[PDB]
Design a protein around this ligand. Structure first.
Ligand SMILES: O=C(O)CN(CCN(CC(=O)O)CC(=O)O)CC(=O)O
Ligand SMILES: [Cl-]
Ligand SMILES: [Fe+3]
Length: 498
């Protein structure tokens, strides 16, 4: 069937509540639900469900002119009232959206007519339109499908305006989507997509090799990277590797001994041979990262000085800080306390485990004892929220989150970045500057504030950047060139054109 594809995903798409998070998969929310404005690779948005808009001089009041031709997939109209009712449902769960400053900025949303939607903002939020374009939460379900006039307590049928409709979901087996035959926009060439739930990366590779699936699309965890490299040479297969999309790093706990010491954090940043880690654990498929954000990220081309692999410098930094080797021992001590750091990761994640083992060995060569704490996902997210880690694997979010929304989230105490940064004397100033950079009209001041925030975070060695990772594709050649979406978390299935 040449206009039907089978793919895989590690989990089900979820119930496709447009306004909630796990277990909803963003790529699947973005398939069914649409924004007012669509994010583009150059960082702009274009008109989408909103054909046009205007703002007050002070930048706090916006009016969107909506399309008049859009139906939800169930036949009900998309109008300003449906849109307004969606904003109300989202903002009734305001606490859950703390990470997204647009959710704390929206003062009012009301339909002025069937086609005029007015949004009022606490201040002049410069990322306003980029945050409306995100997969969640500012997308539109048919208000008939609200439960008890809310979404925060669940939805009925996942009815969107989007080019795909969820046909059916079977927990731990599959999800099936079909083309919306009544879409306001252009119909995708593909009519049906089946997602096989395949949690294990090796099992996903095997499913592709047996012909059970047609397409794999994901980040560096999509399949074993040695297998990907082999598939890239196999003339029966098609593979792709994007330009990098986001950073994988360690977050170092500035509020916990011994990562509370700047000198320890700087040493750890000289300890890791990232090129060898990538060649060894990532089969040479990813790029070395020297900074929290790649220099290509908006506002992040700052000429920050990288900490290159330099075990001699790492040892000298630890020696100068009073961390010295006892007579014939490999682990440094200070005040009789050994230099012992815990590295927390998802213990079933083979790639995390491999990287953690390379980081443990490199750090032992400079006299740091890294204990590996491999735990189930829930325990690792628990550690992240409450700062119960020495070092923890972490990652940035890609476009269009990086850097504004990733920085924004550093102020939220239930997030890894706040907890990692909590020991910094400058943390109150950093959080103040993050607030200011998001609200400032003054473009010169916005750049200076981003420079200050990212320079402090760099100089304080809060992170150990490892890699700028890429999206990867494995496909049956008959599917053709597989496009990438501007938004890192989306998959542009409607652009696939065998
Ligand atoms: O996942 C969440 O609950 C909220 N996100 C906010 C940032 N998310 C966007 C989202 O989930 O909507 C980026 C991401 O999940 O990639 C926190 C996180 O992933 O660390
Ligand atoms: Cl992998
Ligand atoms: Fe998230």
């Amino acid at each position: 069937a040449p206009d039907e594809i089978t793919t895989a995903w590690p989990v089900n798409v979820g119930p496709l509540n447009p306004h909630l998070y796990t277990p909803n998969q963003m790529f699947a929310q973005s398939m069914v639900y649409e924004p007012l404005v669509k994010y583009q690779a150059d960082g702009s948005v274009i008109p989408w469900l909103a054909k046009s808009w205007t703002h007050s001089e002070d930048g706090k009041t916006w009016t969107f002119t909506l399309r008049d031709d859009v139906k939800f997939s169930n036949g009900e109209p998309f109008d300003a009232e449906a849109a307004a009712e969606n904003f109300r449902a989202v903002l009734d769960n305001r606490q859950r959206h703390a990470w997204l400053e647009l959710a704390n900025q929206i003062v009012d949303v009301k339909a002025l007519s069937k086609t005029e939607l007015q949004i009022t903002l606490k201040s002049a939020y410069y990322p306003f339109l980029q945050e409306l374009a995100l997969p969640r939460p500012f997308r539109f379900i048919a208000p008939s499908q609200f439960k008890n006039h809310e979404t925060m307590n669940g939805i009925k049928a996942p009815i969107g305006t989007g080019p795909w409709i969820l046909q059916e979901s079977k927990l731990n087996q599959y999800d099936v989507f079909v083309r919306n035959e009544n879409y306001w926009g252009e119909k995708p060439a593909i009519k049906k997509i089946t997602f096989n739930v395949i949690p294990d990366p090796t099992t996903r590779a095997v499913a592709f090799e047996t012909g059970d699936i047609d397409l794999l699309y994901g980040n560096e965890g999509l399949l074993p990277l040695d297998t990907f490299a082999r598939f890239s040479q196999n003339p029966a297969y098609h593979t792709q590797l994007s330009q990098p999309i986001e950073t994988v790093m360690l977050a170092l706990n500035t509020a916990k001994a011994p990562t509370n010491e700047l000198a320890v954090r700087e040493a750890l940043n000289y300890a890791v041979n990232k090129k060898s880690l990538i060649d060894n654990a990532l089969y040479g498929t990813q790029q070395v990262a020297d900074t929290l954000f790649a220099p290509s990220v908006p506002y992040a081309n700052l000429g920050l000085k990288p900490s290159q692999y330099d075990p001699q410098k790492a040892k000298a930094l630890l020696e100068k800080a009073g961390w010295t080797l006892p007579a014939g021992k490999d682990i440094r001590e200070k005040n009789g306390q050994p230099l012992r750091i815990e590295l927390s990761f998802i213990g079933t994640d083979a790639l995390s485990k491999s990287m953690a083992e390379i980081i443990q060995a490199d750090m032992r060569q400079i006299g740091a004892d890294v204990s590996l704490i491999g735990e189930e996902e829930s325990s690792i997210y628990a550690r992240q929220r409450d700062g119960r880690f020495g070092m923890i694997f972490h990652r940035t979010w890609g476009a269009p989150y990086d850097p504004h929304a990733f920085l924004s989230s550093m102020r939220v105490p239930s997030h890894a970045d706040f907890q990692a940064q909590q020991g910094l004397a400058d943390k109150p100033l950093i959080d103040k500057e993050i607030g200011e950079v998001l609200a400032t009209h003054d473009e010169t001041q916005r750049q200076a504030l981003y420079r200050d925030i990212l320079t402090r975070l760099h100089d304080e060695a809060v992170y150990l950047p490892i890699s700028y990772i890429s999206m990867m594709v494995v496909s049956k050649p008959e599917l053709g060139n597989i496009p990438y979406a501007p938004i890192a978390t989306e998959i542009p299935f409607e652009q696939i054109k065998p």
